[PDB]
RNA sequence: AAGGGCACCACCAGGAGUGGAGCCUGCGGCUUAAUUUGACCAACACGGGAAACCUCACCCGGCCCGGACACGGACAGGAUUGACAGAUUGAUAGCUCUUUCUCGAUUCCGUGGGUGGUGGUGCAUGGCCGUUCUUAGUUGGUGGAGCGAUUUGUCUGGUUAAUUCCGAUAACGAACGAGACUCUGGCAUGCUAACUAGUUACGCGACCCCCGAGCGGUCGGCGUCCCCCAACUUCUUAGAGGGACAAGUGGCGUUCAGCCACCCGAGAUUGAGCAAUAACAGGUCUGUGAUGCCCUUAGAUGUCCGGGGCUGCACGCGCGCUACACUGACUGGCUCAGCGUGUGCCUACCCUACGCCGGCAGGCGCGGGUAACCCGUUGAACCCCAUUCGUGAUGGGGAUCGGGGAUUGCAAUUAUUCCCCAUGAACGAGGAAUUCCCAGUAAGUGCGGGUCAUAAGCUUGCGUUGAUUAAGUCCCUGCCCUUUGUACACACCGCC
């Protein structure tokens, strides 16, 4: 990824790693009382953004943009 | 058209050693891929076997870029009376170990 | 026709040293992966070679 | 005069050939051989060299 | 090894060889009921199998044409003697081979059969041999300048999706 | 001896490659020769993008042609000599093998 | 078309008679008035041509000229 | 002609733009010996067409037959084949001439007949492709209506991306297309596994420490399949699987088809490929040893070689790139990718690590890699952090033009490309008009592949940063359906 993607990956991995460690080694009742703050602040802190990219098509510069067409 | 005699006999004796002979369609190739040690190019192989085909002694087939000349029964005896072969010597395709 | 200049012009490179392996054309040649195949010819033999349109 | 300045027709549906038109017309209704049918149609050298150079 | 070739160029080379072999056999055994070719390649030796309706014709007299063809493809492709083979195999239910049927239309139309007579004759043959559907299209000029296209279809026919690749045989 | 061999399997279709890999592993297990599970190299995707039309006319429609190459490595370690132990390749069309010494 | 030049006339060989460039005298004494090629590939059969100021082999036995 | 429906190749609301400037490129026109040529939504960075030679089809010249085969001539007392030196020629084409040798049935001349052609005709054709159309349309069986062609099924209405379903219903039950399908993306701490992916732990280390951290911190340092000398698959890869169905809740609707919202969930509409009946005298004969016919065929429209041209410019148009600047330019530092390529039958041409030399473009020796093994942890750019500039056609912009140095090639001039130092032009956000577009999208931004001996302002993909507006309509532009009219049916390019 890039700078922003690595920032989001880091902050999200920290949250997931602390939650998972808390789940495995101490009570999940007290996991909920920190997980609820996490989800009420930003759902992206524990759920990865599914959107990645879209393939380019052979009619334009990008995935959906098309080239200029001229009639005259 | 013009060939040295050594070229003509070498081409014919390969065509009688086995009833088939291939040649890439390339008149400018310095030597034929086979029998190159006889110092005869692909060009002289090309025209020698089109003249056989015109006389009917050879049937010609053409894949992508190669010729696939075959030896006919009519052309078998003509090669005998050209290269002076008795009626016993036969090409490999005609007879193998039989 | 004379052996000095019948083929004298060098063709060790360029678009004229390369021809389609099927029809000897010198236009739209595809050399990727060593195909060395004229473009329209490749479409004809695409499935025969093994290429398949997946997406 | 049927073309413009370049040489493209101004009437593609106006056939410029006297023998045939836009719509194919069956010859004799489609009868005879070499033609579309009708409803009626519907109803060893190396060892030899060895002995030769042996002596 | 450096003497060896990269795997990507190797598989491309095999596909080129298969295509040229099939094209050569099509131009050679078209009048001999050609259907297809299957090649099994091992590093020791390679086997070629010509599927054809009339093996009695693809085979030569006492096997002359098989030995003749295996020689001519050996000279073309540079194979060793024991690394090249050539077998001829019959095709079961020849009425389900689009290549074989298209060859019989070519024979009939070359002779001079009426298009309707020949196409309906092959249409009944394919359905008789057992098929969910079939469709023959003949296009071109016959006795006149304007060209025509005739289409003869019966049964079920699919066109879209993956199943058109392995349900419909096209030639 | 103590000899180890590396059999490499390359194919264009996955169903045949998985079949020949399966019965080779089953053969090794039947022969009590220790073997590593077949490791899969990433598939090589031979991608070509030509144009559909044979002339210059059209809407610039490009055809995409994909070829997939699947490659597998299977590792055999026999305490004794191994070539005489395993001699059957059990191959099918479309897939090729190559034998290499583990040290070579 | 409309070639400003005229048609070029190809060479016609002189069609000379038999060689006859070495004789015998006094009931037979071999005498050659043509030089010999001594090269190994040239052989003894070929006879060097005579020109007013040089000698040139029938094959490529180079050319021996005197300055 | 009327009525419904749909669509960012229609609009709305907006974004970025184009049209204004320079330049690259493609058309037209002009000139020229030639400026080869096809194409005029669905032609104009299109023919994968970035052409110095070849390519090449155009022009100026010059070699060759590579005119098979058959017949008739001549000929081992010579049919004929090559050639040194001079002239001759651009040419070291014996092409021609002087000149004699040599070649030895392989040819030569005449008569028939081949053969080849990037020559014509795409309005003679095949195939492929483009478009109508990727919209939703299309056809049997039985039954009903009809004397009949035909009609119903295929419909008022609701709903859907969709004749997609539900519903009325002389129709019932189907088939193609749509869907389904294959691939792709997202998730599985579940399974299978991996020294050609590694991760943790540990053993040696190297440094910072010692205020003491000491089971301290950093290491892309060395090692633990260097096979006895650790485990495991979370991360990487790839297989079998699972997982998502409007499934659960509330509301709307005939309460049916379905629609809206919400919970849990990775995901509550991910993008493609394929794609009906048919039509377009749509494009391709310059893709083919696909092809009919016509033309040429020895002073060749064949083929080869040399040179020029395809670039040429009073001008008009189309796709674009760089810009007009401070939301910026320069300088330095910091710092993050993923597609994917890589040594060749012919084919002579690979990707590059490391060291040394130069300021650079580059050069010279060592190697690695036919590749999850080497380039490579692809140290990408934008961006980020600091410095200078300061509203000035200015340190913006880099056109044009001078001088010089290399690399590629047989050849660089009409500059191939690249580098260095100089000049510094229009351009201060662009009229009427106009294009593309709904989420990782537009746009900013670089990177591979194709072209390639040298090469990208193109194209094809990849990754990075990452939005505004909208969840609607038939106002404009089209298209589809139903009704209607018809003297059309070769079907309005009609008929008359
Ligand atoms: Mg579908
Ligand atoms: Mg300057």
Swiss-Prot record, chain A:
Organism, as annotated: Homo sapiens
Localization terms from the record: Cytoplasm; Nucleus, Nucleolus
Lineage: superkingdom: Eukaryota
Function (record text): Component of the small ribosomal subunit. The ribosome is a large ribonucleoprotein complex responsible for the synthesis of proteins in the cell. Part of the small subunit (SSU) processome, first precursor of the small eukaryotic ribosomal subunit. During the assembly of the SSU processome in the nucleolus, many ribosome biogenesis factors, an RNA chaperone and ribosomal proteins associate with the nascent pre-rRNA and work in concert to generate RNA folding, modifications, rearrangements and cleavage as well as targeted degradation of pre-ribosomal RNA by the RNA exosome.
Name of the protein described by the UniProt record: Small ribosomal subunit protein uS9
Subunit: Component of the small ribosomal subunit. Part of the small subunit (SSU) processome, composed of more than 70 proteins and the RNA chaperone small nucleolar RNA (snoRNA) U3.
Family from the record: Belongs to the universal ribosomal protein uS9 family.
From Swiss-Prot, chain B:
Disease: Diamond-Blackfan anemia 9: A form of Diamond-Blackfan anemia, a congenital non-regenerative hypoplastic anemia that usually presents early in infancy. Diamond-Blackfan anemia is characterized by a moderate to severe macrocytic anemia, erythroblastopenia, and an increased risk of malignancy. 30 to 40% of Diamond-Blackfan anemia patients present with short stature and congenital anomalies, the most frequent being craniofacial (Pierre-Robin syndrome and cleft palate), thumb and urogenital anomalies.
Oligomeric and partner information: Component of the small ribosomal subunit. The methylated form interacts with NPM1.
Record-given protein name: Small ribosomal subunit protein eS10
Keyword field contains Transmembrane: no
Main location group: cytoplasm
Gene Ontology CC annotations of this record: cytoplasm; cytosol; cytosolic ribosome; cytosolic small ribosomal subunit; focal adhesion; membrane; nucleolus; nucleoplasm
Molecular function GO terms recorded: RNA binding; structural constituent of ribosome
Subcellular location, record wording: Cytoplasm; Nucleus, Nucleolus
Keyword terms: Cytoplasm, Diamond-Blackfan anemia, Isopeptide bond, Methylation, Nucleus, Phosphoprotein, Ribonucleoprotein, Ribosomal protein, Ubl conjugation
Full protein: residues contained: 1 to 98 of 165
Domain of life (superkingdom): Eukaryota
One GO BP: cytoplasmic translation
Biological function: Component of the 40S ribosomal subunit. The ribosome is a large ribonucleoprotein complex responsible for the synthesis of proteins in the cell.
Segments forming a coiled coil: none
Sequence similarity: Belongs to the eukaryotic ribosomal protein eS10 family.
Modification Phosphotyrosine occurs at: 12
Swiss-Prot record, chain E:
Annotated GO MF terms: class I DNA-(apurinic or apyrimidinic site) endonuclease activity; damaged DNA binding; DNA binding; DNA endonuclease activity; DNA-(apurinic or apyrimidinic site) endonuclease activity; DNA-binding transcription factor binding; enzyme binding; Hsp70 protein binding
Covalent cross-link Glycyl lysine isopeptide (Lys-Gly) (interchain with G-Cter in ubiquitin), where: 90
One Gene Ontology term, aspect cellular component: cytosolic ribosome
Regulation: Endonuclease activity is inhibited by MgCl2 on apurinic/apyrimidinic DNA but not on UV-irradiated DNA.
pH dependence: Optimum pH is between 8.0 and 9.0 with activity decreasing sharply below 8.0.
Residue numbers carrying N6-acetyllysine: 62
Annotated catalysed reactions: 2'-deoxyribonucleotide-(2'-deoxyribose 5'-phosphate)-2'-deoxyribonucleotide-DNA = a 3'-end 2'-deoxyribonucleotide-(2,3-dehydro-2,3-deoxyribose 5'-phosphate)-DNA + a 5'-end 5'-phospho-2'-deoxyribonucleoside-DNA + H(+)
Protein's cellular compartments: Cytoplasm; Nucleus; Nucleus, Nucleolus; Mitochondrion inner membrane
Modified residues (Phosphoserine): 6, 35, 104
PTM section of the record: Methylation by PRMT1 is required for import into the nucleolus and for ribosome assembly.
N-acetylalanine carried by residues: 2
One Gene Ontology term from the biological process aspect of the record: positive regulation of DNA repair
Main location: cytoplasm
Signal peptide extent: none
PTM annotation (Asymmetric dimethylarginine): residues: 64-65, 67
Domain of life the protein comes from: Eukaryota
Membrane-related topology note: Peripheral membrane protein
Domain KH type-2: 21-92
Keyword Membrane part of the UniProt annotation: yes
E.C. designation(s): 4.2.99.18
Variant or mutagenesis effect after changing residue 42 to D: Phosphomimetic mutant which is detected exclusively in the nucleus
Keyword Signal assigned: no
Listed name of the protein: Small ribosomal subunit protein uS3
Residue span relative to the full protein: 1 to 171 of 243
Swiss-Prot record, chain F:
GO molecular function terms listed in the Swiss-Prot or TrEMBL record: MDM2/MDM4 family protein binding; RNA binding; structural constituent of ribosome; ubiquitin ligase inhibitor activity
Keyword Acetylation: yes
Chief location bin: cytoplasm
Gene3D superfamilies to which the protein is assigned, alphabetical: Ribosomal protein S10 domain
Subcellular location: Cytoplasm
Protein's UniProt keywords contain Acetylation: yes
GO annotation (BP), single: positive regulation of signal transduction by p53 class mediator
Signal peptide: none
InterPro entries in the cross-refs: Ribosomal_uS10, Ribosomal_uS10_CS, Ribosomal_uS10_dom, Ribosomal_uS10_dom_sf, Ribosomal_uS10_euk/arc
Modification Phosphoserine occurs at: 78
PTM comment text: Polyubiquitinated by ZNF598 via 'Lys-63'-linked ubiquitin chains when a ribosome has stalled, initiating the ribosome quality control (RQC) pathway to degrade the potentially detrimental aberrant nascent polypeptide. Deubiquitinated by OTUD3 and USP21, antagonizing ZNF598 activity. Ufmylated by UFL1.
Modified-residue entries (N6-acetyllysine), positions: 19, 60
Function: Component of the small ribosomal subunit. The ribosome is a large ribonucleoprotein complex responsible for the synthesis of proteins in the cell.
Family in the record: Belongs to the universal ribosomal protein uS10 family.
Subunit composition and interactions: Component of the 40S small ribosomal subunit.
Protein name, per record: Small ribosomal subunit protein uS10
